[PDB]
Every structure is written in C-alpha cells, then in structure tokens.
C-alpha cells in the first residue's frame with residue numbers, strides 16, 4: 015500500500031509510486047536506476063509508435079559506437095564547451111591504461127558526423143536521415159531523479175543532413191509534431207510547443223524547438239522532447255560538404271538537424287496522472303489494460319471458467335488482458351497490487367454477478383464502479399478504455415489551462431509565479447535580462463519556450479518586463495526541472 | 496564492383512564486402528565500428544524473431560544500468576577473474592576525478608543479481624525471467640574484426656532464476672534451440688549444438704551449452720551463441736535466497752541461467768554466404784528481397800511513363816503477398832550502377848523491366864545466389880518469385896550444410912588429428928576432458944594457431960566405444976569432442 019501523499023511530500027510519493035508499482039529499482043550506484051519490465055513496456059509502446067512514424071518520413075535505424083575520441087569531441091567549440099563538464103571518460107581497461115582516454119557519448123553529434131563527412135561526396139548522397147535507440151551518459155553531480163533527470167538514460171536520437179535549408183526546417187517541425195503526438199496522443203499529457211530563447215538553446219545549434227509539459231503537483235514545467243536545427247555549424251567543423259550542382263568547384267555545407275526523446279516521458283506520465291493510490295496508466299500505453307479478478311465446488315470451477323471466458327473475448331478484440339486467477343493471493347491483495355500498477359480497468363467476477371450474467375468494471379482514473387451485462391463485454395470495455403484516455407487528457411488539460419496565464423509586469427509576474435503557476439510575459443530576449451529575471455524571482459524562474467501560439471497578441475510598443483528594451487515575444491517562464 | 500577475392504585474401508575480401516555493401520563504417524577510434532542501416536536491419540530481423548519467441552516462454556524485457564561498482568564486480572571471484580583484464584573503467588567526469596572508479600558492464604550478472612536478491616523473498620517470487628537488448632564492452636587489446644570479435648557490440652542477454660533445477664535445465668535447452676533456429680532457419684547457417692569443455696565453459700557457471708558454426712573459407716569455427724546453466728554459484732554469492740513452507744526454516748538458493756546472442760551473427764552470415772560479387776542475404780532476413788529496376792529508359796515520354804507504371808504494378812503486387820520489395824526508380828543513377836549496387840548488398844532477386852519485355856508481358860528475374868536469369872510470365876510474378884525466394888533460402892542452407900558435412904570428420908589418433916586439422920577441417924576426437932590435456936592439444940597442434948575445443952556435440956558423428964582412450968593416451972575418453980582452429 016501507498017503511504018505518502020502527493021500534495022504533502024512530493025518526492026516521497028514519487029519514490030513510493032515508482033517502486034511499489036515495480037517500475038523502478040535502485041542500483042548500487044546513486045543516480046543509476048533499473049527499469050523493471052512494467053516501466054520498460056511503456057518505453058516499448060512509445061518506440062513502436064515513434065519508430066513506425068519516423069520510418070514513414072524516410073528515416074533509418076543504425077548503431078554508432080558509444081565512445082568518442084578526444085579530437086572529434088572538441089571539433090565544435092560551443093557544443094564541447096557546453097557538454098565537457100559532464101562527459102564521462104574511460105582511461106583504462108583492467109589495470110592497463112588506454113593509449114588515449116576515450117569519452118562516453120553524452121549525445122551522438124561528434125561520433126556520427128565524421129562518418130557523414132565520409133558518406134557525403136555529391137548532392138545526390140543527400141539527404142542522410144538516421145536514428146538510433148541507445149543509451150547516453152551525462153555525468154552531472156546534481157541531484158538525479160528517476161526517469162526525469164538521470165546520469166545514464168535511454169533515448170532515441172535522430173540526425174539528418176540536407177542539401178537545402180528548406181528541407182531541414184520542414185523536418186524540424188515534422189519531428190516536433192511527432193513528439194507532441196507521443197505526449198498528447200499516447201501519454202494523455204498536454205504540451206506547449208515553442209522555441210528556446212538564445213540562453214536556453216542547444217549549444218552549437220541555430221535554433222531549438224521543444225515541447226513543455228506542466229507538473230501541477232510541483233508547479234514546475236519540464237521539457238519533454240526537443241528538435242534542433244543545427245544549420246551549418248557542425249558541417250563546417252566536420253566538413254560535411256558537397257560540390258554545388260550549378261557552380262563548378264564550389265563546396266556547400268550540408269544543413270543539419272538533430273532531435274531527441276527520452277524515458278523522461280515515463281516520469282512525466284507518472285507525475286501528471288499518478289494519484290494517492292498509485293500509478294495511473296493511459297490505456298494507450300498500458301502493458302495490461304484489463305485485469306480479471308475472481309471474487310467470493312461446481313461453482314468455483316464455473317467462476318474460473320467464466321473468468322476465462324472474459325479473457326478470451328477481450329483477447330479476440332485485441333484488448334490487452336490478464337486474468338489473475340492465482341490461488342496464492344487474496345482478492346483484496348490483488349485489488350491493491352493492480353491498482354498500484356495503474357491498470358486502467360479492473361474486471362471483477364463474483365458468484366452472484368456470474369449467475370446473473372453480469373460483471374463489474376472499475377475504472378482506475380476515477381474509481382467508479384460500473385455493472386455491465388456479459389453481452390456487452392467487448393464493446394463497453396473498449397468504450398471505457400477510450401473514455402479513460404480522454405478523461406486523463408481532459409483533467410491534465412484543465413490544469414494546464416488554469417496554471418499558465420499572462421502577466422505584463424514584473425510585480426504580477428512574481429505574484430503569479432509563487433502561487434505555483436507558469437507565466438507568459440513580454441520578453442526582450444536578451445541573456446542579461448533572462449539572468450536578471452532568474453535572480454529577481456528567486457528557485458528562480460527560467461525561460462521555458464517562446465510559444466508558437468501564445469495566449470495573447472503582443473501589442474505595438476509593448477515593453478519587456480525589464481522596462482529597458484521593447485518586447486520581442488511573449489515567452490513562457492516558470493520553475494523547471 | 497568488388498576487387499579482392501575470397502579464396503585469395505580473406506581479410507581484404509571481408510573488409511571490402513562489409514564496406515561496399517554499406518554495412519560497416521570505420522570509426523575514428525581504431526578498432527571501433529559503425530553499424531549502418533543495411534547491417535542494423537539484419538539485426539532488427541533477428542531481434543523480431545527471437546523477441547517474439549522468448550516472450551512465448553514468459554521472458555520480459557527490461558533495462559539495467561551500464562555501470563558496475565567495485566563491490567559488486569568482485570562478489571563472484573572466478574567470473575570477475577575471467578573478465579577483469581578487459582573491463583573498461585570510468586575514472587573522471589569532465590576534469591573531476593571520481594572518488595571511486597566505476598566499471599562498464601562486460602556482461603550484466605553483477606549488475607542484475609543484487610536486484611534479484613532484493614526481489615526474491617519467497618518461492619512465489621520465482622521464476623524471474625528477464626532479458627535486455629543492449630551493448631557491452633570487452634576491451635581486449637588483441638586486434639578486433641568487424642562483427643566477429645569487437646570491443647563493443649550489441650547483444651541480448653537473458654537472465655533467469657528458478658526455484659527448482661528441472662525448470663532451469665529445461666530453459667537452457669529451449670533457448671539453445673532458439674539460437675539454432677536463428678542460425679539455421681533465419682540465416683541459413685548450419686550449427687553444431689554441444690556443451691563446452693571444462694576449460695571453455697563460463698567462469699563460475701555449472702555448465703555451458705553452445706552452437707558452433709564453421710567458416711569454410713578460413714577453416715575456422717566460431718561460437719554463435721551460448722546458454723549457461725549457472726546453478727547456484729551466483730545465488731550463493733549474491734544471497735538470492737527464498738524460503739518455502741515445504742522446507743521449514745531453510746534458506747534455499749535460486750537456480751539460475753544466463754544466455755546471450757550478438758551481432759556476430761551477421762559476420763557469420765557474411766563469412767558463410769558471401770561470394771566474390773559481394774554479400775548474399777538469405778531471403779528470410781533480407782531488408783529487401785526483390786529490387787525492381789527499369790532498364791533501357793533512354794533519350795517516347797509516354798512509353799517511359801508506362802514503364803514506370805508497370806514497375807509500380809510489380810511493386811504493389813509483391814507487397815500484396817508479403818514480399819519485401821523496393822523499386823529503385825531513381826533517374827540520377829544508371830541501370831548498371833543499380834545492378835552492381837544491389838548485388839553488392841546481396842538482394843536475393845533483381846527484377847528487371849525493359850520496354851520490349853513490358854510490351855511482351857514478361858520480366859526478367861536474376862537470383863543473387865546463382866546468378867541465373869529467368870524470363871517470367873508477368874502473371875506469375877507473385878507466385879514464381881515466392882518460389883524463387885524459397886529455393887534461394889534452401890540453396891544457401893544446402894550448400895553451407897554440405898560444406899560443414901565435408902569438413903567435419905572423426906579421428907582417434909593425434910597424427911590423423913594433425914593431418915586433418917592442417918587440411919582446413921574440424922575434428923571430433925575422443926577426449927578425456929581434462930584442462931591440462933586441452934592445453935597440450937593446443938600447444939601440440941600449433942607446431943609439434945593451435946586447435947581449440949569447440950563443443951562436446953549432443954549428437955556426435957560416432958558412438959564412443961566403451962574403454963576408448965583419449966587421444967592423449969593417458970586417460971579414458973569421456974566423450975567425443977569437436978576441436979578446431981577458432982575465432
């Protein structure tokens with residue numbers, strides 16, 4: 015049973031939920047966590063969806079080495095200056111020191127792009143569109159949090175190279191829309207699409223697009239996925255070049271994008287939908303969508319037979335169902351065990367209901383008990399699974415809609431901010447003003463994104479909240495992971 | 496096309512095949528390789544088959560950290576003694592030296608088994624059947640060979656814990672049969688199932704089962720996959736203990752297996768089926784089974800357009816029938832470039848569409864394995880191509896099988912053994928099983944590289960005679976044992 019309240023001590027609740035659902039185990043080392051099968055199945059669902067979608071775009075899977083040389087890692091000064099502090103270095107095998115230290119990848123730009131330079135000889139070799147599903151390492155010394163912010167994590171990283179800027183800019187937004195679909199369609203989490211400010215953009219890229227989610231329980235926002243236009247910054251450094259088809263002998267540098275999505279997804283799901291009885295799984299990603307549980311000697315065998323009847327009908331219509339007919343456990347124990355793991359529907363079959371040709375469906379999101387005729391089993395349960403998905407999104411949506419507001423001045427900005435909300439404010443865009451906002455609001459508020467579709471229209475002559483410069487865009491600010 | 500020839504310079508031939516088929520690219524770290532999409536799709540095909548199979552056995556996928564602590568890594572002393580010289584060690588982040596160095600997994604027994612010990616509190620907590628698809632590092636200073644022996648590689652490793660020995664013993668053999676299926680039914684490579692000698696078994700384990708494949712071109716055999724029975728050696732070190740009410744008060748130690756398969760599969764496929772024209776993909780793993788190429792579109796717009804339409808028609812029809820078909824309709828590459836390009840990549844069937852054949856309602860199919868061309872009635876497209884593909888998969892197996900059959904023979908004396916081994920063959924000999932004898936065989940065969948034990952076959956070529964002496968002459972033989980030059 016769960017023993018911490020989400021609205022009292024959030025960290026204690028998070029720990030409780032992820033371990034009692036059997037999603038996470040703690041490793042010997044700190045900041046390193048084990049994805050047990052209940053969590054990993056959510057990641058596999060995401061992968062199935064996203065992998066099919068990127069295949070539709072022409073992207074292909076590959077696998078690049080986990081180690082990068084010192085020379086490659088250093089070639090793009092801004093990138094390396096941003097990542098160097100947290101790069102992990104291997105220096106020996108056994109007692110034998112290596113010829114040269116080698117780095118574990120924090121991101122794959124510098125392991126892939128010498129190869130791209132090799133593969134791109136002429137215009138017809140482009141575009142190159144590659145993806146890999148792998149693990150990466152960001153050995154920061156700050157406090158790690160399972161799923162949300164870890165030292166090793168699983169992700170997908172895509173890397174594309176194009177002959178023209180237009181193709182590249184188009185892919186950036188196609189990928190970002192896919193990420194939005196993962197969050198909203200699969201995990202029932204609303205997200206805000208936007209661009210990162212100059213201070214928060216990917217080091218070495220030209221611009222970064224992103225989706226931001228809101229964790230109401232802590233009043234904080236978190237980046238869910240990211241899609242960069244790197245432009246020609248990396249291709250100039252790695253010499254990914256092709257001869258201009260029109261102008262003899264002129265070399266052109268490829269235009270590049272990279273884009274990433276991680277198991278942070280599962281953490282957000284958990285923070286957004288979890289409750290005080292445990293995890294709550296959106297049906298669209300649930301490993302088990304329905305769990306059949308008997309309640310209450312010809313009658314005992316008839317009851318288990320009926321349970322099986324329900325299992326086979328639900329499987330017949332492609333609903334993911336488990337019948338927990340274990341005799342080694344109590345029915346109430348089974349109830350709690352599967353509520354903790356977040357199974358969308360509990361299907362209870364007891365003797366009275368069975369002789370009456372009905373069963374009970376219990377929704378996880380609301381706890382509501384429905385009695386359903388045996389006749390309707392497949393149809394109604396399908397309906398209910400869809401309602402759960404919608405309900406989960408709707409509630410989360412309402413939270414976003416009440417916790418993201420507009421503020422045109424610094425005083426109202428501060429007041430709103432420490433009520434636990436995020437705030438769209440008119441912003442001039444300068445790094446100096448962003449730093450100043452951070453300290454004056456101190457955790458201090460960071461920039462989250464410049465919304466594609468902001469709440470209000472910026473009006474002519476609007477000044478930034480610093481008063482010094484004119485406003486360039488409504489920008490979403492808040493406390494962040 | 497290709498330059499080096501397989502029978503002349505095998506290492507050069509192999510380098511050329513894997514790069515010109517765009518399977519492999521060299522990394523800036525010497526001895527490190529990139530799996531390009533054409534190679535990774537074979538890995539994905541193998542993963543699809545085997546992942547489905549082990550889910551039918553109750554195995555669940557998961558993911559454990561890449562890093563191991565000093566504490567855990569030493570808790571089974573023989574396992575760690577076997578792996579320690581090739582364990583990579585992380586010693587700093589950025590410029591900051593770590594208080595404690597941390598090791599990269601060479602294999603995850605020492606990452607997972609502390610967790611197993613936490614999760615097992617009773618016999619209803621068993622079995623635990625977990626698998627992960629990941630990468631491991633074995634940083635040996637011998638020189639690597641792409642796919643076959645690398646410092647980092649992808650694999651799957653499955654780890655099971657059971658209350659009784661009977662269940663564990665059954666799983667060892669079920670997984671081993673699945674690996675034999677991967678090799679024989681997916682990659683068209685015949686294998687020998689067997690058990691490893693005491694010298695070659697998994698350090699700290701009880702016994703190791705294995706599948707061995709023969710590479711005719713080099714006369715060397717190679718271990719294709721392994722399925723260990725770890726008994727209670729690891730549960731006793733990591734205290735994976737449970738109590739059964741059946742046995743009051745006694746802490747019982749789980750019975751454990753671990754099993755693995757890697758991208759070495761692809762190298763073996765390359766070494767077995769490749770020829771002097773390039774790679775040869777078995778149809779069952781082929782990313783593209785059938786490539787459609789229009790021929791002779793040259794300097795009427797209507798007839799070129801109709802040629803395109805007819806190619807797309809073949810495309811639609813072969814999709815209709817679960818054939819993985821791709822039409823290469825690019826205008827910026829000539830037809831000969833495409834013929835060569837897809838032959839190098841090993842596409843089982845080339846389907847050529849010319850204007851004369853289009854107007855005469857036929858096409859030409861070219862089988863990659865034999866090169867034979869076939870004019871085929873257009874209506875039979877869907878049905879004959881299927882047939883051809885099945886025949887290809889069989890032919891690849893048949894040829895490989897007869898290779899193995901003629902290169903695996905029996906001998907009972909060290910002189911016959913040496914002659915046969917210098918023939919480029921592998922040998923079943925009566926063997927006493929002792930480690931010192933295996934060391935002596937390897938020294939003597941080298942000059943007196945050396946021959947290594949490969950496996951003790953489940954089904955040897957001959958029944959061992961009662962009272963047969965090992966080829967060492969000192970001790971009685973325990974079993975027929977396959978020996979050979981090996982990777």
Ligand SMILES: Cc1cc(N2CC[C@@](C#N)(C3CC3)C2=O)cc(NC(=O)Cc2ccccc2)n1
Pocket residue numbers: 045152153154155156157158159161162163164165167169237238239240274275276277278
């Ligand atoms: C699990 C996860 C996720 C992410 N990030 C980043 C942005 C991004 C997005 N969007 C990446 C592009 C994909 C994301 O998911 C980042 C991380 N670790 C770290 O920063 C390292 C670390 C370690 C311990 C404490 C604090 C920080 N850990």
Ligand SMILES: Cc1cc(N2CC[C@@](C#N)(C3CC3)C2=O)cc(NC(=O)Cc2ccccc2)n1
Pocket residue numbers: 633634635636637638639640642643644645646648650718719720721755756757758759
């Ligand atoms: C690609 C691949 C495969 C395998 N091994 C092992 C046995 C096994 C089987 N069966 C694994 C347990 C599953 C296998 O495939 C092993 C390896 N590297 C190494 O030994 C490291 C190395 C590096 C450079 C030179 C020499 C040696 N590299």
Ligand code: PRO
Pocket residue numbers: 121122123170171172216240242272273274275
């Ligand atoms: O780390 C990042 O944010 C980018 C996106 C995936 C590849 N690198």
Ligand code: PRO
Pocket residue numbers: 601602603604651652653697721723753754755
């Ligand atoms: O390395 C090995 O051979 C065993 C099997 C996979 C996990 N450990």
Ligand SMILES: [Ca+2]
Pocket residue numbers: 096097098099100
């Ligand atoms: Ca940093």
Ligand SMILES: [Ca+2]
Pocket residue numbers: 346349350
């Ligand atoms: Ca209850």
Ligand SMILES: [Ca+2]
Pocket residue numbers: 577578581
């Ligand atoms: Ca060793």
Ligand SMILES: [Ca+2]
Pocket residue numbers: 701702
């Ligand atoms: Ca034994």
Ligand SMILES: [Ca+2]
Pocket residue numbers: 744745746
């Ligand atoms: Ca006791």
Ligand SMILES: [Cl-]
Pocket residue numbers: 405408409
């Ligand atoms: Cl509602």
Ligand SMILES: [Cl-]
Pocket residue numbers: 446447450480482
């Ligand atoms: Cl200011």
Ligand SMILES: [Cl-]
Pocket residue numbers: 969
């Ligand atoms: Cl003696």
Ligand SMILES: [Zn+2]
Pocket residue numbers: 441442443444447478479480481482483
């Ligand atoms: Zn300002």
Ligand SMILES: [Zn+2]
Pocket residue numbers: 926927928929932965966967968969970
């Ligand atoms: Zn002997």
